[PDB]
Design a protein around this ligand. Structure first.
Ligand SMILES: Cc1cc2nc3c(=O)[nH]c(=O)nc-3n(C[C@H](O)[C@H](O)[C@H](O)COP(=O)(O)O)c2cc1C
Ligand SMILES: Cc1cc2nc3c(=O)[nH]c(=O)nc-3n(C[C@H](O)[C@H](O)[C@H](O)COP(=O)(O)O)c2cc1C
Ligand SMILES: Nc1ccn([C@H]2C[C@H](O)[C@@H](COP(=O)(O)O)O2)c(=O)n1
Ligand SMILES: Nc1ccn([C@H]2C[C@H](O)[C@@H](COP(=O)(O)O)O2)c(=O)n1
Lengths: 234, 234
C-alpha cells in the first residue's frame, strides 16, 4: 500500500525512500504537463537532522553541488541576474529568460530569491520578537503567478508553495509545502536550498535547529527518470 | 509517541482523533500569541470521504451549523459585508471590523471569499482544461498580509495558507495546507468550509470526489478548551 508519510534521519535517506515509494507504489500513473510520471498525492516527509542537506551518494548526480551552491547564492542574494549567475549552465535557459507575452510585464519573474528578500525583514522580526509565533510563513507561489497558467511562457510557475518557520524551546522547526515536486531530480536541489535557508534563518535568530517537514501535493517521478532512480537505489 | 499522520473515514473521526492526539501526546506545550496550548507541529490528516464535512455529534457545538452555513454563504459569495452577514453573531466583531492603523488601507481585509473569487476563473480554467494539472492552488495567506504582524489589528492573519485541487482519473483531490489550526473549535468551521468548497469545485468541473488532505504547521488545542474536547471524546 502506498506509504504517504516518510520519516528519515537525514535528507538522503528521505530522498531515497520517497523515490523508491513513488517508483514501487504510486498512487497515480499519470500523463502530466511535462510527460508521464508515477505520482503520490500529498506525501509528508520528515527529516530529523536538517544539517544533512548535501547528500553524500555521488550517484545522485543530476543536481551537482556546484550548481546547487550557485543556485543558493543566487537565491539568498535576492537578485534577478540569472543569466549571469547560471552562465555556466546552458540547460536552464528556458527558466531564466524574459517573459514573451505582453500581458505580464518585463520585470515579471518567478525567482524565489526576490520574494524571500522582500519578506525577510517582517518575517525575521516576527520570528525573533513574537514568542512562539505561528505566523512566520514565506510565501513563494503567489496568486499573481496564475497569469502564467494560460500562457506559452516557460518560466517556473512556483513549485514551492510556502516555507513556514517556527521556534519552540530554542529550536527552529521548518515546514516546506511544495505544490509540485519532481522527487528524482529537482528535489535534490529543493532539499539543498531549504537546508541552506533554514540554517540561514536559525543563525539569524541565534537558535538551534529542530526538524524539517516537506509536504508535497504532487510528489512525482517521471518515467524517463526511472533508470536514474534505480541507479541510486541500493 | 506523538502521532502526526492521521487517516480517518470521515471528517468527524479525523476531528476527534486529531483533538485526542493533541490533548494526550502533544509535541509542545506552549504559551502562544493567544494563550497556552498543546501543539503538534506539521500534522497531516486524511479524510477518505469528504462529503462528511457536517459532523453529526451534537456535542461538537462550538461552531453551530447555522453559523458555518452563514459563513460558507459569506465566503463563496465573495463579499465584504461581514457586519451584515454575521449580524446575528456579536462575538465575531473583532475579526470583521475595519482596519485601525493608517498604514494599510481601509479596503484591506483578510476575508477568504474575495481571494477565492479573484482566483476562481483562472484556477477553474486550469483545472478543467489542463489535463492532470498540478498547478491549481488557491492562495489564501498572502505576503501582503505580513503588514498585520507588527500591528495592533485584530483581523485574522490568514490561518489557511493554500488549498490545492487536482483531478486524476475523474476524481477531485484536495489538499488544504493550514498555517495554524485551532483543532478543537475553528477546525470544525474550516472542515465545513473546505468540504463545501471542494464540492463546489468538483461540481463546477463535473467530476467526482477523491479524498481530502489537511496539513497543519501548527495543530493546537488551547488549554482553556480541554474540558470542551473531553466532552466530545467518548
Ligand atoms: C530559475 C530556475 C528555475 C527552474 N525551474 C525549474 C522547474 O520549474 N522545473 C524543472 O524541472 N527544472 C527547473 N530548473 C532547472 C533545475 O534547477 C535543474 O537544472 C534541472 O532539474 C536539472 O535537470 P536535468 O539534469 O534532468 O537536465 C530551473 C532552473 C532555474 C535556474
Ligand atoms: C471573518 C472572520 C474571521 C475569523 N477569524 C478567526 C480567527 O482567526 N481565529 C479564531 O479563533 N476565530 C476566528 N473567527 C471566529 C470563528 O469563526 C468562530 O466564531 C469562533 O472560533 C468561535 O469561538 P468561541 O465559540 O470559542 O467563542 C473569525 C470569524 C469571522 C467572521
Ligand atoms: N523548486 C521546484 C520547481 C519546479 N519543480 C518541478 C515539479 C514539476 O516536475 C515541474 C513543474 O511542473 P508543474 O508546474 O506542471 O507542476 O518542476 C520542482 O520539483 N521543484
Ligand atoms: N480559518 C482559521 C483562522 C484562524 N484559526 C486559528 C488558529 C489560531 O488558534 C488562531 C490564529 O492565531 P495565530 O495567527 O497566532 O496563529 O485562529 C483557525 O483555526 N482557522
Amino acid at each position: 500500500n502506498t506509504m504517504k508519510y516518510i520519516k528519515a534521519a537525514d535528507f538522503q535517506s528521505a530522498f531515497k525512500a520517497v523515490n523508491r515509494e513513488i517508483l514501487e507504489n504510486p498512487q497515480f500513473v499519470t500523463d502530466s504537463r511535462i510527460g508521464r510520471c508515477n505520482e503520490i498525492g500529498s506525501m509528508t516527509v520528515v527529516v530529523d537532522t536538517p544539517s544533512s542537506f548535501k547528500m553524500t551518494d555521488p550517484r545522485i548526480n543530476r543536481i551537482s553541488y556546484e550548481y546547487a551552491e550557485d543556485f543558493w547564492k543566487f537565491m539568498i542574494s535576492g537578485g534577478t541576474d540569472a543569466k549571469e549567475a547560471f552562465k555556466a549552465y546552458p540547460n536552464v535557459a528556458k527558466f531564466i529568460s524574459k517573459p514573451k507575452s505582453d500581458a505580464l510585464p518585463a520585470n515579471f519573474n518567478t525567482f524565489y530569491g526576490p520574494r524571500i528578500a522582500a519578506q525577510l525583514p517582517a518575517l525575521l522580526k516576527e520570528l525573533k520578537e513574537k514568542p512562539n509565533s505561528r505566523r512566520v510563513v514565506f510565501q513563494i507561489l503567489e496568486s499573481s503567478d496564475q497569469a502564467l497558467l494560460d500562457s506559452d511562457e516557460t518560466l517556473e510557475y512556483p513549485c514551492t508553495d510556502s516555507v513556514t518557520y517556527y521556534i519552540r524551546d530554542g529550536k527552529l522547526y521548518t515546514h516546506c509545502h511544495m505544490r509540485s515536486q519532481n522527487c528524482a531530480v529537482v528535489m535534490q536541489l529543493d532539499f539543498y536550498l531549504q537546508g541552506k535557508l533554514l540554517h540561514y534563518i536559525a543563525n539569524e535568530c541565534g537558535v538551534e535547529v529542530g526538524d524539517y517537514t516537506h509536504t508535497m501535493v504532487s510528489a512525482h517521478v517521471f518515467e524517463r527518470d526511472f533508470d536514474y532512480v534505480k541507479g541510486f537505489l541500493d
